[PDB]
From a paper:
SA lipase (SAL, also known as glycerol ester hydrolase), a triacylglycerol esterase, shows strong cytopathic activity in host cells. SAL, an ester bond-hydrolyzing enzyme, is secreted in prepolypeptide form containing 690 amino acid residues and is processed into its mature form containing 394 amino acid residues. Its active site is composed of a typical catalytic triad including Ser116, Asp 307, and His349 residues, similar to other serine hydrolases. The SAL crystal structure exhibited a typical α/β-hydrolase fold comprising a central twisted β-sheet flanked by α-helices on both sides.
An inactive Ser116 mutant with Ala substitution, which lost PNPB-hydrolyzing activity, was also constructed. The SAL–orlistat complex, which was isomorphous with native SAL, showed strong positive electron density maps of orlistat molecules near the active sites of chains A and B. The crystallization condition of the S116A mutant crystal was different than the native SAL crystal, with the former displaying a hexagonal system and with two molecules in the asymmetric unit. The S116A mutant crystal had a different crystallization condition than the native crystal, as shown by the distinct dimeric form. The S116A mutant crystal structure also bound to fatty acids near the Ser116 residue. Wild-type S116A and S116A mutant differentially bound to fatty acids at the active site due to amino acid differences between Ser and Ala. The carboxylate moieties of fatty acids shifted closer to Ala116 in the mutant than in the wild type. In the native SAL crystal, three fatty acids were observed near the active site, whereas only one fragment was bound to S116A mutant. The fatty acid bound in the S116A mutant was located on the short α-side chain and was almost 12 carbon atoms in length. The native and S116A mutant crystals did not use PEG under the crystallization condition or during cultivation or purification.
Numbering used by the authors:
A (entry chain A), B (entry chain B): 4 to 385
Write the structure that this text describes.
Amino acid sequence: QPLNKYPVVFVHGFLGLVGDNAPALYPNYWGGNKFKVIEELRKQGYNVHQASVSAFGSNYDRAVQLYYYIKGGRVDYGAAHAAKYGHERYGKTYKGIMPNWEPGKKVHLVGHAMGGQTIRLMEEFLRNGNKEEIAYHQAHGGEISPLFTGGHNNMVASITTLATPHNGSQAADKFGNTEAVRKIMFALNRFMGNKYSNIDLGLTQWGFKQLPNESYIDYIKRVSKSKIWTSDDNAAYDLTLDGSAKLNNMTSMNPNITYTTYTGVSSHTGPLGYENPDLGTFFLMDTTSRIIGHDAREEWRKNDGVVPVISSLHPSNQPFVNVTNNEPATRRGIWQVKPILQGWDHVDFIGVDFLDFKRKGSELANFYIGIINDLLSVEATE
Amino acid sequence: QPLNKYPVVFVHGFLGLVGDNAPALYPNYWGGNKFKVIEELRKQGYNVHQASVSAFGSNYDRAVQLYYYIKGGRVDYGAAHAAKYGHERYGKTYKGIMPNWEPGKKVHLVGHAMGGQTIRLMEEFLRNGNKEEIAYHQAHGGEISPLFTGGHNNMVASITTLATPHNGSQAADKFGNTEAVRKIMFALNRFMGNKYSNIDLGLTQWGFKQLPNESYIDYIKRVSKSKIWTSDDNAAYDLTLDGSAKLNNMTSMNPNITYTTYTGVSSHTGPLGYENPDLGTFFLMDTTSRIIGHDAREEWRKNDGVVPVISSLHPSNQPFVNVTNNEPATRRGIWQVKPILQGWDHVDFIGVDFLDFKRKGSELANFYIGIINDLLSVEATE
Ligand SMILES: CCCCCCCCCCCC(=O)O
Ligand SMILES: CCCCCCCCCCCC(=O)O
Ligand SMILES: CCCCCCCCCCCC(=O)O
Ligand SMILES: [Ca+2]
Ligand SMILES: [Ca+2]
Ligand SMILES: [Zn+2]
Ligand SMILES: [Zn+2]
C-alpha cells in the first residue's frame, strides 16, 4: 500500500555500481553509510528503486539500459546505432521494475551526476523516438525497440537532477576524455571482463567479456580491434562541453513533466580570482577541482570538485526559474533551480565522503526526505 | 489484376447489418445513399469487402467471426470461452473472402466505431493467441482454432479506425449498458430470432433462435434461462470505459502494422462550459451527445454524438503521433492520429445521415478515396 503513487527510480552517474554489481570495498552508492537511501525510504513506506546501468557507457547506451531496467526485457541499442559505432546490438536482459510500464503509468526519475543526463535522453526517446532507428526499421523491417518509436507520453512524472553536468565539465575535456586516461579506463574494463570477473563495468557490448574457452591473450587480441578505443560513444566524451551540448541540442521540455535541479559548491576564491577546492572536498577530486577552478573564463570556475556550477544549475539553452528552498516546486515544463548547497561537493550528495564529518547523516536524510516531499507535491497536483 | 495488392476489409460497428442480412428499411451501412462504398470502389478497380459480424455481440465473439469471415470455415468461439460465459461453442459457417489467408498474404483492415476495436482484438489473437484457450486445449485435447494459437504474423498490413471508441464511451456506461436498455435490446434479439425471421442480430449463440416445432411461449421460457441477460460478454459492456480499458490492457502495437485513426466533433461549447450537439447531428444521437457533453471531466466532453474525442484519437495507453492531412501516413507501429473532422458526427463517416445536406456525397467519396490512397502508400513502402 506504498505511500507514493508513482515509483521513484534513482539513477547513478559516471562511475556508479549498485547492489550486487558493486564489489565489496566499493561504497554503497546511494547514501554510503550516512543514509542508506533505498533501505530507509522503504522503511518509511515509499516505493523506491536503484537503477543499475553502464558505469563507463555513453548516455545513449545508458538511456537504453535505463528503459529496460524499468520495463524489463533484453537491451536493444538499435540496429543503426550498433552499426554506426561498432558495438553489439543486444545486451543484458533485465527482470523489470514494472513490466506494466506504458502511457498513464508514471515513474519519478532522480539522477545523480551523469544520471541526470541519462534521465533526460531516455525521456526524449520515449516521447519523440529516434529518427535514425525509425528510418532504419522503415528500410529493413524486423524489430524495433518501443523506446525508439515515439508517441509515448505520460510515462514520467518528474525529472530531478543532483550535481548533473548539464553543460559538461572541463574535468572531462582536459583529463578524463584524453587518450591517456581513456586507455587506462578501457584496460580496467578489459581486465574486469575476464572469465572470473564478478562485476560488470558497462562496456561488454564492445567485446569486453572473455569467452569461456578463450585464452586471456586471445581475448586481448580480439578486443584490441574494437572501435571503443577511439569512439565518441562512451561516458568520457558525453561528459565534455561538446558532448553535453549535443545532448542539449536534441532534448526539450516536456510541458507535462516536473523539472527540478540541485547544485553544490565546494571551492573558494583565491586573491587572483581563481577557484580552489575547500578542505573537505573528497581528496580524489582535488585535481579535477583545480582544472575547473583555473579556467580562463570566470563563470566556469566555481565547482563541486568535478562539475562547475554553471553546468549543474540547468541545461543552458533550456528554460529555468530560480526557486527558493521551501516554496512548493510544482511548476511543470520548466527547470526549477534550487539554491546552491554551500560546501557540498559532488559526492556529498550521495554521502560517500567518509572523511567529511561536517556533512552529517541526518542532514542527508533531510535532503532526501525533502526530495520525496516535492515528489508527493507533484503527485498531488493533476 | 485489382489496383490494390492486399484486399481491404470494412468492419461495421455496434448496430451494423450488411448486405443480405440488412432488412429493407435499414440503410446501406457503408456509405448510405451518399457514396456506395463497396460498389463504387470496385468500379474504380479496388478489391474491397464488407465484413458481416455480430451486431450486439462482444468484441470477442465478433473478432472470432471476423477471422472466419476472412478465412472461411465454421465459427469456433473457443471451448473455454464458451464454457465460461455460457454460450454455444460453434456458430455459423462462412464461405471465406480468401480461403488461402496465412502469413505473407496480407489484408487491410478498416473499422467504423466498434469495428476498430474488433480489428484490434482479432489481430491480437493472430499474433499472440489466447492463453485461456491454449491452456484449455493443453488440459482437454480436442480441437483449437488457429485463431487462438499464436505466431501468426504478416497477416494484416494496416489497421485504420473511423470514430472508434478506443477508450469507451460514457454513452455506454450511462445509457445503453443499463439493465433497462440491455433488456430492451435482448427482447429485440429474441423477437428477431423467431422462426419466420429473416435477419440475424448476432446473438444466436445465446439461444435466440426459435426451433422449428417450438411455440413462441416455449421459446421465451427456454431463452429466459440464458446467461446473456446478465453476461459481460456482449457489445454494451465492451463499449463502456471499463470494457474498453480491458481491451487496451491486453492489446499492443505490432511494430510492423500501419495504424491510423479518424475522429469527428459535432458538439459546441455552451456558456456554462459543457458541450451540446450541433444542428446537423443525427437526431437519434442527441441524447447520448448531451450525456457525454455534460461530463464532470472537461477533457471528456467534446464528442461526435456518441463517442468522446479523447476516446477516438487513440487507445490512451498506446503510442500515437499527430499527423497532418496531406503528408503520407506511412509510419509503422504508432497510431497516426488524423486532424479532427470538424462537424462530422459519428454516423457522417458512413454517410447514413440522410437529413445532413451539409455532408455531401462527393466529400464522402474523397474521404474514402483518401483512405485507399493511404493504403496504397503502405503497400508502396516496407
Ligand atoms: C577513472 C578516472 C576518471 C575520472 C575523470 C573525471 C571526469 C569528470 C566527470 C564528472 C561527472 C559525474 O560525476 O558523473
Ligand atoms: C440501443 C441504443 C444504445 C446506443 C448507445 C451506445 C453507444 C456506443 C458507442 C457507439 C459505437 C458504434 O457505433 O459501434
Ligand atoms: C423523446 C422521447 C421521450 C423520452 C425522453 C428522453 C429522450 C429519449 C431519447 C432516447 C435515446 C435514443 O433513442 O437512443
Ligand atoms: Ca565533501
Ligand atoms: Ca451529421
Ligand atoms: Zn552505444
Ligand atoms: Zn462470447
